[PDB]
């Protein structure tokens, strides 16, 4: 039951925030509905969920159009998969957030292909913080350059950072890696305007991500199953 899992996930989030002195409202739950059918999302929506994350463009754009013509309003769609240049038009036309900005060219395409009547696309720069087997995300030493360039684009809005750490089961390493992301985030937050989103943490490391300072956790299986 999706509505029951939603409530169970929000309990774990609220628990973890409270334990480390944070207000539960500081942590946005982003329900990762990738691979989940539109019927399952519609249940989630009925249980009050409004923020949904998708890994693949055409799957995501089809859900977006579905709930639009149903006249369902007030949703927020986040593209959280790797973004190919040949699919950026659809992200720039249909999504509200994109978490995977890791090269300036792809961000300039999104800015150019973004219709003017829409609000700027909120974007996070993705950091490869600890995953040597991943080609996704920049190194921290490139952050200031990429952030400055991306910050300039008028149809985008730089909101913060995202990382998918390498899989880790030792809580100590989970926390140390997320702290590195929280430190970079704080550093960016001082100089850049409207930096308010650290997209970090999934079910396996949710506690350490929240204790380290994440503002948004990405939960998929624990909501929709597989
Ligand atoms: C294995 C795989 N999955 C998904 C995609 C992209 O999915 P979508 O067409 O929904 O954007 C690609 C792109 O070719 C792919 O190679
Ligand atoms: C970004 C992301 N978070 C989470 C999951 C799985 O959800 P859970 O956090 O419960 O492991 C997946 C895929 O289903 C995912 O792609």
Numbering used by the authors: 3 to 228
Would you copy out the relevant sentences from the publication that reported this structure?
Although the actual cellular role of this protein is unknown, it has been observed that mutations of the PLPHP encoding gene affect the activity of PLP‐dependent enzymes, B6 vitamers and amino acid levels. YggS binds PLP very tightly and is able to slowly transfer it to a model PLP‐dependent enzyme, serine hydroxymethyltransferase.
We serendipitously discovered that the K36A variant of YggS, affecting the lysine residue that binds PLP at the active site, is able to bind PLP covalently. This observation led us to recognize that a number of lysine residues, located at the entrance of the active site, can replace Lys36 in its PLP binding role.
